């Protein structure tokens, strides 16, 4: 669910970028939101696979 929230926040930054075309740290935030969402997804996959092993 954090990935879902981190992917939503990343998509909001891309929209905001279109409006505020002079603030370049918005596009950077989106990139970090998309890389941290993938890392959250990795943990979820490892937690799911390691909890179904019992």
């Amino acid at each position: 669910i954090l990935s879902v929230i981190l992917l939503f926040m990343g998509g909001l930054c891309i929209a905001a970028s279109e409006f505020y075309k002079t603030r370049h740290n918005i596009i950077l935030s989106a990139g970090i939101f998309f890389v941290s969402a993938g890392l959250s997804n990795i943990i979820g996959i490892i937690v799911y696979i390691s909890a179904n092993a019992g």
Binding site: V35, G38, L39, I42, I45, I46, I49
Partner: protein, 49 residues
């Protein structure tokens, strides 16, 4: 009755289902690790990069 000398010596033995030669699969070098590990290594590889 009076039997003759045995023409076939025998006894009680053990019968089991004949095993298989277990021909190794083509992609059996991956067997030391589970499919989940191999898949997670690829994900980890992408993430690290």
């Amino acid at each position: 009755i009076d039997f003759s000398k045995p023409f076939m010596s025998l006894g009680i033995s053990i019968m089991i289902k004949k095993p298989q030669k277990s021909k190794p699969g083509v992609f059996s070098f991956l067997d030391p690790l589970a499919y989940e590990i191999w898949m997670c290594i690829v994900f980890a590889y992408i993430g690290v990069s």
